[PDB]
Scaffold this active site. Structure first.
Site, PDB file in Angstrom:
ATOM      1  N   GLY A 237     -28.993 -31.514 -19.605  1.00 20.79           N
ATOM      2  CA  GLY A 237     -28.419 -32.404 -20.551  1.00 20.79           C
ATOM      3  C   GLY A 237     -27.022 -32.997 -20.392  1.00 20.79           C
ATOM      4  O   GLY A 237     -27.036 -34.118 -20.659  1.00 20.79           O
TER       5      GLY A 237
ATOM      6  N   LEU B 139     -38.361 -16.854 -32.256  1.00 18.66           N
ATOM      7  CA  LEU B 139     -39.071 -17.014 -33.667  1.00 18.66           C
ATOM      8  C   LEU B 139     -39.267 -15.395 -34.191  1.00 18.66           C
ATOM      9  O   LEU B 139     -39.835 -14.725 -33.509  1.00 18.66           O
ATOM     10  CB  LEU B 139     -40.501 -17.503 -33.360  1.00 18.66           C
ATOM     11  CG  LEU B 139     -41.457 -17.613 -34.622  1.00 18.66           C
ATOM     12  CD1 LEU B 139     -40.763 -18.677 -35.437  1.00 18.66           C
ATOM     13  CD2 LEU B 139     -42.561 -18.222 -34.312  1.00 18.66           C
TER      14      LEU B 139
ATOM     15  N   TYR C  28     -35.993 -11.012 -17.874  1.00 18.14           N
ATOM     16  CA  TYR C  28     -35.763 -12.440 -17.012  1.00 18.14           C
ATOM     17  C   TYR C  28     -34.723 -13.031 -17.308  1.00 18.14           C
ATOM     18  O   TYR C  28     -34.595 -14.403 -17.690  1.00 18.14           O
ATOM     19  CB  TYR C  28     -37.050 -13.259 -16.970  1.00 18.14           C
ATOM     20  CG  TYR C  28     -37.233 -13.935 -15.682  1.00 18.14           C
ATOM     21  CD1 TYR C  28     -38.544 -13.812 -15.216  1.00 18.14           C
ATOM     22  CD2 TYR C  28     -36.444 -14.770 -15.290  1.00 18.14           C
ATOM     23  CE1 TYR C  28     -38.839 -14.188 -13.874  1.00 18.14           C
ATOM     24  CE2 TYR C  28     -36.502 -15.395 -13.968  1.00 18.14           C
ATOM     25  CZ  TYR C  28     -37.890 -15.151 -13.203  1.00 18.14           C
ATOM     26  OH  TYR C  28     -37.876 -15.776 -12.061  1.00 18.14           O
TER      27      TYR C  28
ATOM     28  N   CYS D 103     -37.373 -22.410   0.874  1.00 17.68           N
ATOM     29  CA  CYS D 103     -38.127 -21.316   1.075  1.00 17.68           C
ATOM     30  C   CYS D 103     -36.986 -20.159   1.426  1.00 17.68           C
ATOM     31  O   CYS D 103     -35.633 -20.542   1.303  1.00 17.68           O
ATOM     32  CB  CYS D 103     -39.088 -21.213   2.391  1.00 17.68           C
ATOM     33  SG  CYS D 103     -38.035 -21.345   3.958  1.00 17.68           S
TER      34      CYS D 103
HETATM   35  N1  LIG Z   1     -31.316 -15.314 -15.288  1.00 13.40           N
HETATM   36  C1  LIG Z   1     -31.846 -16.265 -14.931  1.00 13.40           C
HETATM   37  O1  LIG Z   1     -31.855 -16.827 -13.972  1.00 13.40           O
HETATM   38  C2  LIG Z   1     -32.903 -17.030 -15.868  1.00 13.40           C
HETATM   39  C3  LIG Z   1     -34.132 -17.484 -15.668  1.00 13.40           C
HETATM   40  C4  LIG Z   1     -34.930 -18.061 -16.215  1.00 13.40           C
HETATM   41  C5  LIG Z   1     -34.987 -18.153 -17.852  1.00 13.40           C
HETATM   42  N2  LIG Z   1     -33.519 -17.188 -18.110  1.00 13.40           N
HETATM   43  C6  LIG Z   1     -33.458 -17.051 -19.677  1.00 13.40           C
HETATM   44  O2  LIG Z   1     -34.789 -17.104 -20.363  1.00 13.40           O
HETATM   45  C7  LIG Z   1     -34.578 -17.508 -21.568  1.00 13.40           C
HETATM   46  C8  LIG Z   1     -35.525 -18.890 -21.693  1.00 13.40           C
HETATM   47  O3  LIG Z   1     -34.766 -20.097 -20.936  1.00 13.40           O
HETATM   48  P1  LIG Z   1     -35.322 -21.402 -21.122  1.00 13.40           P
HETATM   49  O4  LIG Z   1     -34.338 -22.286 -20.450  1.00 13.40           O
HETATM   50  O5  LIG Z   1     -36.788 -21.479 -21.016  1.00 13.40           O
HETATM   51  O6  LIG Z   1     -35.012 -21.507 -22.713  1.00 13.40           O
HETATM   52  P2  LIG Z   1     -35.546 -22.468 -23.943  1.00 13.40           P
HETATM   53  O7  LIG Z   1     -34.974 -22.364 -25.038  1.00 13.40           O
HETATM   54  O8  LIG Z   1     -36.247 -23.818 -23.394  1.00 13.40           O
HETATM   55  O9  LIG Z   1     -37.331 -21.716 -24.074  1.00 13.40           O
HETATM   56  C9  LIG Z   1     -37.626 -20.672 -24.843  1.00 13.40           C
HETATM   57  C10 LIG Z   1     -38.926 -20.850 -25.274  1.00 13.40           C
HETATM   58  O10 LIG Z   1     -39.342 -19.497 -26.229  1.00 13.40           O
HETATM   59  C11 LIG Z   1     -40.201 -20.051 -27.159  1.00 13.40           C
HETATM   60  N3  LIG Z   1     -40.038 -18.824 -27.961  1.00 13.40           N
HETATM   61  C12 LIG Z   1     -39.032 -18.318 -28.841  1.00 13.40           C
HETATM   62  N4  LIG Z   1     -39.485 -17.379 -29.516  1.00 13.40           N
HETATM   63  C13 LIG Z   1     -40.735 -16.909 -29.075  1.00 13.40           C
HETATM   64  C14 LIG Z   1     -41.574 -15.832 -29.560  1.00 13.40           C
HETATM   65  N5  LIG Z   1     -41.100 -15.091 -30.507  1.00 13.40           N
HETATM   66  N6  LIG Z   1     -42.590 -15.992 -28.898  1.00 13.40           N
HETATM   67  C15 LIG Z   1     -43.153 -16.716 -28.013  1.00 13.40           C
HETATM   68  N7  LIG Z   1     -42.416 -17.912 -27.862  1.00 13.40           N
HETATM   69  C16 LIG Z   1     -41.153 -18.008 -28.165  1.00 13.40           C
HETATM   70  C17 LIG Z   1     -39.403 -21.260 -27.545  1.00 13.40           C
HETATM   71  O11 LIG Z   1     -40.387 -22.048 -28.144  1.00 13.40           O
HETATM   72  C18 LIG Z   1     -39.099 -21.896 -26.631  1.00 13.40           C
HETATM   73  O12 LIG Z   1     -40.182 -22.796 -25.870  1.00 13.40           O
HETATM   74  C19 LIG Z   1     -33.102 -17.989 -21.636  1.00 13.40           C
HETATM   75  O13 LIG Z   1     -32.150 -16.843 -22.292  1.00 13.40           O
HETATM   76  C20 LIG Z   1     -32.583 -17.941 -20.045  1.00 13.40           C
HETATM   77  O14 LIG Z   1     -31.347 -17.744 -20.056  1.00 13.40           O
HETATM   78  C21 LIG Z   1     -32.830 -16.635 -17.095  1.00 13.40           C
END
Ligand SMILES: NC(=O)c1ccc[n+]([C@@H]2O[C@H](COP(=O)([O-])OP(=O)(O)OC[C@H]3O[C@@H](n4cnc5c(N)ncnc54)[C@H](O)[C@@H]3O)[C@@H](O)[C@H]2O)c1
Ligand SMILES: NC(=O)c1ccc[n+]([C@@H]2O[C@H](COP(=O)([O-])OP(=O)(O)OC[C@H]3O[C@@H](n4cnc5c(N)ncnc54)[C@H](O)[C@@H]3O)[C@@H](O)[C@H]2O)c1
Ligand SMILES: NC(=O)c1ccc[n+]([C@@H]2O[C@H](COP(=O)([O-])OP(=O)(O)OC[C@H]3O[C@@H](n4cnc5c(N)ncnc54)[C@H](O)[C@@H]3O)[C@@H](O)[C@H]2O)c1
Lengths: 553, 553, 553
Positions: A50, A271, A319, A407
């Site tokens: 963003g 949610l 995760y 990789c």
């Molecule tokens: N530590 C890491 O390297 C790492 C890697 C990947 C993701 N993450 C974490 O994973 C989370 C998601 O990341 P993102 O960028 O995809 O965020 P994001 O906000 O784009 O995606 C979250 C998704 O979860 C869905 N959601 C919310 N509540 C739900 C529920 N109860 N049931 C089903 N779906 C639901 C939302 O509609 C949304 O699409 C974040 O907390 C991020 O920090 C961390």
């Protein structure tokens, strides 16, 4: 200014615009960061996230390009939050560019002060690879998520994921990579997502294969495809905090359980049970306290289900969405009985300096990458999982901008590969030089207590000496450009990390830098983890003959 | 332990287990509180109102029964939160039992601390009539709920509820009286209840007429029955926090909206949105903090819907479960925009000492109650409303356990009736002694700023000297058992209140106690409201010749 | 009306204003509470504690007096926060007055709401004995502090404090009693006080014998006076947080260590190390947060010194000033290694129903009290500490208003003494009836988790069923007046407690009530502590034949 209606693409082939390949490389990779096929919003200089920019503003961008075009091999450009601030005399074995983005004195390291500086024209968020010119599109997150699933698969399942399935949730910015990663790893997956529009998007982009009509249908499809030995991702519109406990109740046993709901943000990203999306967004405005409480209660239930899967022996992992802490605060006292994916799967790899080795063909020729893919398989002949990744990346990962590859390779092998690539440039097998870099998330290049350095065995999570030493050492070693960034991934205040990229131009002077840099860069990661007392890292240091005074003498 | 697989029933007829009728009476009423026809969940000692219990646990129950059986007429048993703690020498004109349940030093008067003490074996929630042994099934509250509906009818609908309908929820022990009260007032009703077993219980005891198959079905029935001028109650299996917001969305307009879920105790008495009752009870054991959060968030949504109804011009009120308070705590700043039923509808009755006066036939004989019904009509020959109440009670109110009667009368008439009943016991017209009591909801026996003393004209809502004085005076006057409880109706922290029961055993000694106790008890209520400056109460005190030094001299 | 320029004193001799001694008693004791010799500010009806009042305002006072004067022996007056609200028919064996002061529904039990009500003419703070008409001036606090020191002497020094010395601080409203109590108990004392004006006051009133010039001088005097077997109190102008650590450094061992600085109030009541009182007051206005931290830090140092004393075997105790809590919050993790004075010394006495038995001669004659003193000695001949106190009282304690006495007397002896006093009235040994009461701080009559019920062994600190049952039982038993108060000692929200007073008018009817009340009142205390599982209480219950169903069957 802020907005420009232009399309920017990296120059191609062997003709130089800059004065040498050492300066042509950062110039091409900066422009690649802004490629319409690569970048999120390049007309505002946004690469990803963003507000993750390649340059502070258009005047800064113009001047960077200008300066890189006339920069000599004995000069070094300083980029300060996306602004070309100075050019100083160094030498040809130093980096041509030194980059420091988004760094704030700690007491002021927050989004509020960032915004104040931004208002004053003083700021740019570099994220990881946005400001440091080594972003290669979605391959990063796709390959990265693939690595988590494949490593978990190596540890629990001997690398055999055929007929197995992953249960997870979230098809958002990062979570959307899960279904494809699973498929490429050779597993089926059930992917729960509460927004239909995000499922539609992932279906349209072929990240997820199918949407089930309901849970029963999802389970029938999973049973079918796993029995057939297929690797198919399935989306289910619903709520993970409703579906996971139901699966536990039904005695359904997946082969891996994780989650990428935005549980870190209960008001906006998670949610509550029983709520539509819909009700969630409406209530978030009028009764935010109640919404946060409803989401947090739901996370407790969700984590209880994840714990139930683990009690049945299912590999279960967080995760990085803070869901375990959220649940713990609600009285799930055993919430941390399952580990985060980094401590479980990524850190043991980091202990051996195994991290996301990334390269790009400056020529722009796909064939240059296919040639390097074949070279990698040749030099690492006994590793079946690497071969599978490279086989299906060609088939299933589309190049974006300059053809590039990731990789995971460790201490010893990084240098072996870099030198081979360099020899391929020298021989003319590769049509033009290649750059070798990485994300900022590597063994010795990141401090991030909520993510990559969470729960270090010695309690050293927040020590950020390490990425700073990594950047200093890569400068001393001869990387082509070196970066220090603050707040990538987790935001202002929460991380410090370093980048490096090195050009392989076929010369022996490059070979000398490559040998040093590609030893030292993963070497610092082995050192960092050996310092914390990880046996794998200590053993790796000894095997590779690393000189670690407090360990090896 | 709090579970025992037994059926408890009051002994019947004229044979004594205890040493006298003064001690037989509390023994029988304690057992009657636990009768399977009377109590909501007696195998767990639960009578009504969430976890309103008759005794702390089964060991305490056993010892209370044992002690009452051996108690002398010059001795007094002390009951401390449902535990028999001491027997002390008093005299025959003092109460045989003194009960103090759920009382906590104010700073610690909350559900969290209560639960901590409960887990240690140190606590019991008395509710009002659960811990003080004067609960008579759904009949206890049915006239109060009826008077509320009728008065709302007078204020809003010109005194006629024909073709009108009430929307509410909660078909528990006390909530179960709502459908019948509505019917008797001439209104149809839609009553939402989350447990099928509770709907069954109300159907079985004739408190609700029928059950709809779904919301659509319920609405068509309401539309038809109201158009036909019928007064029929309809139960709907579901969650009020889901259905009410849905009804708001559809533009459905009931003629009155209230609620009587057990919102006073979020952990035990209120089902969160999207949860089954089974999930709710299981999760209450493992993640109580999450459960409270989920329930309170759901209450916030529920009260938002009630507020929406009110804004549409629908007469809306709080029916004494503290739901507005719960919602306000979660961010619903305007939760108190709709009033409690007492300041809106019932207070003028309290000003005359009129309240949930009741009696039960210890004999177990339905004919004893019918005889008292006839005597009441004889003594109050001109009150058409009361005669009709008694006719409808006979026609439509089923006895539960020991035959009993609810009959709202005030200062002057309580003693007149009491003395007449005692004469009937002496003459043998009544086959055995009767007990006379009341709910703790009554004019002089409760301080509760979110219910009985909400919006006092002089701002004295929170002053709790009054119930304490009432219990002390009932003790001085010669009630058979006297109680001081905390948290009844509205939950921990929100009320203090007293109870009294007196046995009419036909003696001249009882007559003397009855004459003063049944004068003094409503007398304190008239006094309390006269103190606050209510002219009805002042006029009533003067008519009855009450000695109120600051008013009458 | 708030202020009246009048002097009020109890009527003396045998001439009645009221109709009997049952109503003359509360009348006299009410007026005695306002005696210029007794009360702090009686022209505004203030008995003690700045706002602890006898009646709500002057109109209420007038009406209480008028009502008591005409009250019949079969009538009971209700007093509601100092207001005579109703008179109801009871009987001659019930209390003539029932009092409930300052009681608020828990959620509203705070000073802010009290103040709101007070501004509307709806409130009165009753403290403990201010609103319940049984205050006898400074004898309460002097005798009470004496009992702490004597009991510590009994537990640690074989009941002899000769040659012993107490080290403490604070010569304030309550702290000022320490030096006199230590002296009377037979010990020397060193009393640290930071305000010279407070030392001056105590020197003038002879509560403190002398002032040392410096610490070295104080220690020379202490060594000398203890070696000579004298009991002399010494004031030292200084800071406890400076002096105590210095005494530890010097290896000085006092025989008792306690503290009554106002540590509960860091902004106003606790002088920081190294600050003058003027600096403290000045800085409190400009930098209050810094002041609070300096004071809290100083408390940590002070408590460290107290722990150092305890480690050396010095009896060390908290005197209810919150200092342990304050130090704990600052990292003195073992701050609760020394007990509060109640758990350590007073509670073992409460377990045997030993509490502050108090009585007053309605005649006004000192000879009446001297006769009862001798009678107590006669009926308890083998308790040397009792005999010492009564001898000490005659010579060192001056009567204020009606001659009155306090004595610590337990279950069994209270009734023995009361029946004896009654016989002395009958025989004319005493020239007029006597009243027997107590402070609200007795074994069965107070719940106050920060004081008298701190750290109950079963965790029942906040259970307030007990004082309520005590009040109900004393009403049933035949006390002359009974009181239920909220917030005495610790303020709104933090305590609930009961009072009782009984007149010994020499009649057979009073004897019957005395035998009951004086058995039951301390009996409820033994019961309460036996319920908590204290062996001393259980043992006492069995010795006295108490009927405690859950302990004895
Ligand atoms: N530590 C890491 O390297 C790492 C890697 C990947 C993701 N993450 C974490 O994973 C989370 C998601 O990341 P993102 O960028 O995809 O965020 P994001 O906000 O784009 O995606 C979250 C998704 O979860 C869905 N959601 C919310 N509540 C739900 C529920 N109860 N049931 C089903 N779906 C639901 C939302 O509609 C949304 O699409 C974040 O907390 C991020 O920090 C961390
Ligand atoms: N207003 C009065 O005069 C008065 C008198 C007595 C009791 N009360 C209060 O009335 C309330 C109910 O008392 P009770 O004895 O019926 O209690 P109860 O615990 O026996 O029953 C509560 C009912 O609420 C139902 N319920 C809970 N959450 C629900 C939801 N979200 N949707 C639909 N149904 C739901 C439960 O299934 C249960 O049947 C309590 O708060 C009690 O303190 C008021
Ligand atoms: N629990 C009980 O029953 C009980 C009994 C007695 C006292 N207390 C507690 O003891 C404390 C004192 O009560 P009080 O009414 O006397 O208060 P107070 O404010 O009248 O007296 C406190 C005295 O401490 C002095 N002081 C403050 N800091 C000092 C320091 N650093 N060194 C020496 N002197 C210092 C002040 O000058 C003042 O004279 C209060 O917290 C009270 O609650 C409790």
């Amino acid at each position: 200014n802020k907005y420009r209606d232009v399309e920017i693409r990296a120059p191609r082939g062997n003709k130089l615009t800059a004065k040498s390949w050492l300066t042509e490389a950062p110039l091409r990779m900066l422009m690649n960061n802004l490629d319409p096929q690569v970048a999120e919003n390049p007309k505002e200089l946004v690469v990803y996230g963003g507000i993750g920019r390649a340059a502070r503003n258009w005047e800064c961008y113009d001047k960077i390009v200008e300066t890189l075009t006339r920069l000599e091999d004995d000069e070094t450009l300083l980029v300060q939050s996306g602004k070309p601030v100075g050019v100083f005399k160094t030498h040809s074995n130093a980096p041509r560019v030194l980059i420091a983005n988004s760094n704030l004195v700690p007491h002021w390291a927050n989004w509020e002060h960032f915004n104040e500086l931004d208002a004053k024209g003083l700021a740019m968020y570099g994220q990881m690879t946005a400001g440091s010119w080594i972003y290669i599109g979605s391959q990063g997150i796709v390959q990265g998520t693939y690595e988590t699933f494949v490593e978990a698969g190596r540890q629990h399942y001997g690398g055999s994921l055929k007929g197995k399935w992953v249960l997870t949730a979230g098809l958002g910015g990062m979570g959307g990579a899960q279904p494809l990663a699973a498929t490429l790893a050779g597993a089926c997956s059930l992917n729960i997502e509460s927004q239909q529009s995000r499922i539609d998007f992932r279906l349209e982009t072929r990240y997820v294969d199918e949407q089930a009509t309901d849970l029963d249908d999802a389970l029938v499809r999973i049973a079918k495809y796993t029995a057939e030995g297929k690797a198919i991702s399935i989306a289910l519109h619903g709520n993970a905090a409703e579906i996971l406990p139901e699966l536990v109740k039904r005695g359904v046993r997946p082969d891996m359980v994780t989650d990428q709901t935005s549980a870190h943000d209960p008001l906006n990203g998670y949610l509550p049970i029983g709520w539509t999306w819909e009700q969630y967004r409406d209530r978030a405005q009028t009764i935010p306290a109640a919404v946060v409480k409803a989401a947090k209660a739901s996370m407790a239930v969700h984590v209880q289900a994840m714990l139930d899967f683990q009690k049945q022996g299912v590999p279960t992992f967080d995760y990085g969405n803070n869901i375990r802490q959220m649940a713990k605060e609600e009285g799930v006292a055993n919430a941390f009985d399952f580990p985060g994916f980094v401590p479980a799967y990524i850190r043991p790899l980091f202990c051996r300096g195994v991290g996301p080795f990334r390269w790009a063909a400056l020529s722009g020729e796909a064939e240059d990458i296919y040639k390097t893919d074949a070279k990698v398989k040749e030099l690492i002949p006994d590793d079946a999982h690497l071969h599978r990744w490279l086989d299906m990346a060609r088939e299933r990962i589309s190049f974006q901008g300059l053809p590039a590859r990731i990789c995971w390779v460790g201490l010893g092998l990084r240098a072996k590969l870099g030198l081979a690539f360099n020899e391929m440039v020298r021989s003319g097998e590769l049509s033009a030089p290649v750059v070798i870099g990485r994300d900022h998330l590597d063994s010795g290049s990141v401090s991030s207590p909520n993510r990559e350095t969470e729960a270090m065995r010695d309690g050293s999570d927040a020590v950020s000496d390490w990425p700073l030493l990594n950047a200093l050492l890569n400068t001393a070693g001869g990387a082509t450009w070196v970066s220090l960034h603050h707040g990538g991934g987790v935001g202002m205040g929460f991380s410090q990390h370093s980048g490096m990229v090195i050009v392989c131009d076929g010369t022996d002077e490059a070979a000398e830098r490559i040998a040093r840099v590609l030893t030292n860069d993963p070497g610092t990661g082995v050192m960092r983890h050996a310092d914390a007392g990880y046996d794998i890292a200590i053993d790796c240091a000894k095997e590779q003959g690393l000189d670690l005074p407090m360990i090896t003498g």
